């Protein structure tokens, strides 16, 4: 007994890639192939469709009825999985395909580190080995945020975290502007609230979107991908000598991989298993990873 | 600014739905505590932008499952109501059924009241937990979890445990059948809340990751305090005569000592349940029907789309 409909890979493959998705999946190809992005990421790009479409759809039947003059406000689809399994990947290849679609041409990702944090917030309370967790995030402002687009908001902005300095951008804001559909991503998104008191109004992060993406993979696996970025790191963006984590390139190949072990092992590890892993079944589809980032398995939430 | 469409009641009559016969017949008992005024301009058209809610995922099942090649039928779409005790939930619940079931395209529908879910008297009691009936730790969860589980997994014949308020108890090997309808109506105090965390690694679902849409019934504490002092007073005038009754004893008090007893209740119990596990959760909702002291509708809130 199950609520997911479930799909191997050949059962998935029960459309085409244009110039056009060739050109805004830029960068994007080269990492996820040619192959992988034409089987499982443009069909589930077509699957989205028909939940966005739907909605649109709902949207206009029910504000007719209801004789609400008011615009749609924007689908909102999360990504969630641990640190390093592909979440940013996986939306910006949903970025540039959902976007090929007449209904919905306007796609924004929002990333949740955005709402980390900084450093020096982090580092007075403790929590620099800690970011990524729920503490180390600043929630009412992710909230007051995906509450500003559900609300229909114009011009919403959206912090900024740079991976290459390790820290909030102060100062520095992406735009959301009411688009068709927003791709929320990050770690935390299939968690609840700290309840400060018990009287605390409660919502989530999940109240505010209308379908969740968990991307799985075994934890084993998931290491291997982050030791193998921060390695990748290691022989481009940190020689940069204002880069965050500098100090990495003057330690050997197999000091960076053990150090990078050592921060999976006792930071991201321990937050994907206390805090990611789970709230994994509150997601409406599972996509399943194998060690060499195919999609071997797709879990879809019955209707 | 606001993640909610809003009416007044002006305005969500400014929405052909007639109350026919057959909606009167199965109103029977509802009409006379509703009134055939708020039936008729509040929930006849607001089981009409429910029944859009369901035919469109109804639709959307059907396009998706042919997309994706899939024969499995439909599940049922799920709407929760949650709010404070005796703030009318039940009431809305039934008054929801009659008139959702008018529609060709989901004519049944189920009812299910968590109270079901409750723990029995002696296992609340064993645990100290007469005092919290109605707070999250009186429920048992995971037989909850696991039936909104089935429906949702498409599962026939889920038998749901059900409870007597005269009793005060669930009752012992008395089960209803919900049986893959089109729309199970999910009515209970704590719906919207979440799960509590033995371990930081237990696997965690909530209620409304079941569920398709929830309405929240709302109004102030003082108003809701009468309800549900007027509530055990109506019993105390005739189900409590009832030897048998759980509250039986209650007979031998006054009117006035009863209403003492049902003022005291609702202040250390109904109403702290409803400050610290219900309203906070009130923004969940994704509609909130907002009652003045006569119960009359004066407020909706709906999520926009
Ligand atoms: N589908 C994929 N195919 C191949 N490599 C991938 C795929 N998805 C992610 N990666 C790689 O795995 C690592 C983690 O990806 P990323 O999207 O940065 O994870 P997250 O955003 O969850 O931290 C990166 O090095 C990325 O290049
Ligand atoms: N819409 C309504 N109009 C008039 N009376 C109502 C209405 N809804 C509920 N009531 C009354 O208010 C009390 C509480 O209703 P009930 O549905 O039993 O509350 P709950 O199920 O939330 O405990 C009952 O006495 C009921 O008759």
């Given at each position: 007994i199950?609520?997911?409909?479930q799909?191997?890979?050949?059962?998935?493959?029960?459309?085409?890639?244009?110039?056009?998705?060739?050109?805004?999946?830029?960068?994007?190809?080269?990492?996820?192939?040619?192959?992988?992005?034409?089987?499982?990421?443009?069909?589930?790009?077509?699957?989205?469709?028909?939940?966005?479409?739907?909605?649109?759809?709902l949207?206009?039947?029910?504000?007719?009825?209801?004789?609400?003059?008011e615009?749609?406000?924007?689908?909102?689809?999360?990504?969630?999985?641990?640190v390093?399994?592909?979440?940013?990947?996986?939306?910006?290849?949903?970025?540039?395909?959902?976007?090929?679609?007449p209904?919905?041409?306007?796609?924004?990702?929002?990333?949740?580190?955005?709402?980390?944090?900084?450093?020096?917030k982090?580092?007075?309370?403790?929590?620099?080995?800690?970011?990524?967790?729920?503490?180390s995030?600043?929630?009412?402002?992710?909230?007051?945020?995906?509450?500003?687009?559900?609300?229909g908001?114009?011009?919403?902005?959206?912090?900024v975290?740079?991976?290459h300095?390790?820290?909030?951008?102060?100062?520095?804001?992406?735009?959301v502007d009411?688009?068709?559909?927003?791709?929320?991503?990050?770690?935390?998104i299939?968690?609840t609230?700290?309840?400060?008191?018990?009287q605390?109004?409660?919502?989530?992060?999940?109240?505010?979107?209308?379908?969740?993406?968990?991307?799985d993979?075994?934890?084993?696996?998931?290491?291997?991908?982050?030791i193998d970025?921060?390695?990748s790191?290691?022989?481009?963006?940190?020689?940069?000598?204002?880069?965050?984590?500098?100090?990495?390139?003057?330690?050997?190949?197999?000091e960076?991989?053990?150090?990078?072990?050592?921060?999976?092992?006792?930071?991201?590890?321990?937050?994907?298993?206390?805090?990611?892993?789970?709230?994994?079944?509150?997601?409406?589809?599972?996509?399943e990873?194998?060690?060499?980032?195919?999609?071997?398995?797709?879990?879809?939430?019955?209707?």
């Open positions: 199950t609520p997911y409909l799909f191997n890979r050949q059962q998935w493959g029960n459309l085409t890639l244009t110039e056009s998705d060739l050109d805004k999946l830029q960068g994007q190809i080269e990492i996820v192939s040619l192959k992988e992005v034409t089987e499982i990421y443009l069909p589930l790009s077509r699957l989205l469709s028909f939940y966005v479409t739907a909605r649109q759809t949207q206009q039947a029910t504000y007719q009825f209801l004789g609400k003059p615009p749609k406000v924007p689908y909102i689809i999360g990504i969630a999985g641990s390093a399994v592909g979440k940013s990947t996986t939306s910006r290849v949903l970025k540039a395909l959902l976007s090929r679609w209904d919905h041409p306007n796609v924004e990702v929002i990333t949740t580190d955005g709402f980390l944090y900084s450093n020096a982090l580092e007075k309370q403790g929590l620099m080995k800690r970011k990524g967790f729920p503490e995030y600043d929630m009412p402002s992710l909230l007051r945020v995906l509450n500003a687009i559900k609300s908001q114009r011009n919403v902005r959206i912090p975290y740079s991976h300095y390790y820290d909030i951008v102060r100062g520095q804001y992406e735009i009411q688009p068709d559909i927003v791709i929320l991503e990050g770690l935390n299939l968690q609230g700290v309840r400060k008191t018990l605390q109004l409660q919502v989530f992060v999940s109240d505010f979107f209308d379908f969740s993406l968990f991307v993979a075994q934890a084993q696996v998931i290491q291997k991908w982050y970025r921060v390695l790191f290691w022989r481009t963006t940190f020689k940069d000598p204002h880069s965050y984590f500098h100090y990495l390139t003057q330690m050997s190949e197999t960076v991989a053990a150090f990078a072990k050592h921060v999976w092992n006792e930071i991201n590890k321990v937050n994907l298993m206390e805090n990611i892993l789970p709230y994994k079944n509150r997601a409406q589809l599972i996509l990873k194998a060690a060499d980032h195919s999609i071997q398995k797709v879990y879809l939430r019955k209707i």
